[model samples]
Target: SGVFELKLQEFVNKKGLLGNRNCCRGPPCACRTFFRVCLKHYQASVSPEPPCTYGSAVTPVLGVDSFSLPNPIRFPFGFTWPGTFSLIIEALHTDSPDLATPERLISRLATQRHLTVGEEWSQDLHSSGRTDLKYSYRFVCDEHYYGEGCSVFCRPRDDAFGHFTCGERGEKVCNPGWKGPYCTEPICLPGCDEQHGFCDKPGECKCRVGWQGRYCDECIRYPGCLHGTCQQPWQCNCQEGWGGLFCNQDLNY
Candidate 1:
């Protein structure tokens, strides 16, 4: 009922990855309506730039007369439409003349998603009429997924874990006081000094050796070292004339 979205991608090989353009013969390398699913007649010259336009797009026609590349190209980008009677598409054999395009009307079923705003659809197929066979295509993203490749599983757009929400790329964006790629790392207040302190959990800051304080900024002084100061973990800096190990005993008394 509203604007329909589509992003198409296609690359084919007889049994592998090469995209052959000879669709009318065996090896059945049937090129899709060849390319660009256009709504109106498209006149051409040479070196056609694949278009990303409204309605539909069509690839440049290459026949016995004109020279064009035969490798199957992917339309990673997408487009939109206003309306259509039902789910249908046109397909043609690569060698066929332009006027005879749409070898036949393909009654391909496309899911109608009143789903608007940012959401999109994509399909990858190669064919025409009954001729549009053996080719394949499908919507890019599925429920609970987002990303260019739609591979990363993420938190649902609906009910979430309270502290996190799904990002455009299907990643967890944590609320304040949190950190990390998945947003699970808790950030304690007063901030722990990485070199001196750390916290495996929320709120508490655990200080390391030679370090102690609310924020782990203080270097712990040597224990039982009277008149002596601490420089390292347990080493004491003795004052002049202090001779004892604890720096308390007078050497020239």
Candidate 2:
């Protein structure tokens, strides 16, 4: 015949297990895991139900034993990731010498894990590795995972270790700007107190050239202490060359 379907059907009729329901019902089943697209069609007459069907077994939090990554998973010390296994992204500068940008590194990692990094995502600085050789990442599980895309997550569950931990083996300390083991902190930059110039550090402010202090209220050109404290009549730590209660006296010291 000119059709391949007819030839295939004719060959199946001669086979021993053609449309046999009890085929591979014994041990050593290869199709143990049920995938999303496993059954494209479900016949109403199909009895005893399908073997590989989805259950309500919620994916346990990653690192927490919901689904651990065995020994092949590890992350940066100061760097924190979301989950444990599913969308795991472990990139070390040791792995690639040309990892200039995290996106390039994570993009290659996404390809390895069969995932696509969402557009317009942020890359954190992985402080765990050496300053010259560190890489950070953000991982996400495929929708087929138990938590859908949120698999490999760290929950606020207490592990066997006396202290409460996030997931099974999540990080001990959360990143800056956020507290708690889980990333549940509010989105505020470093200098949110309106004292510094747009969140540079916690207690330090970046002043403009020649202007110093927490709010650039002092000038370096003025004859005052270099400690950024302006010279005042009542309270003054007078300049180096001029040493007086208010730098008003011309002292030889």
Candidate closest to the true structure, highest lDDT: 1
- Could you estimate the TM-score for every candidate? 0.41, 0.20
Q: List the residue pairs that clash in candidate 2.
A: 60-66, 63-168, 64-168, 83-152, 84-152, 191-199
How many clashing residue pairs are found in candidate 2? 6
- Candidate 1 yields a Cα-based lDDT of 0.47
Candidate 2 lDDT, 120-196, residue by residue in tens: 22233222221111222333333222232333334343333222334322333344444444444333444333432
Q: After superposition, which runs of candidate 1 have C-alpha atoms over 4 Å from their true positions?
A: 1-117, 120-142, 148-151, 156-163, 188-191, 239-243, 250-253
How many clashing pairs per prediction, in order?
9, 6
Error (Å) of candidate 1 at residue 148 is 4.1
Report lDDT (Cα) of residue 250, candidate 1.
85
- lDDT of model 2 at position 125: 29
TM-score, predicted candidate 2 vs. hidden true structure:
0.20
lDDT of each: 0.47, 0.28
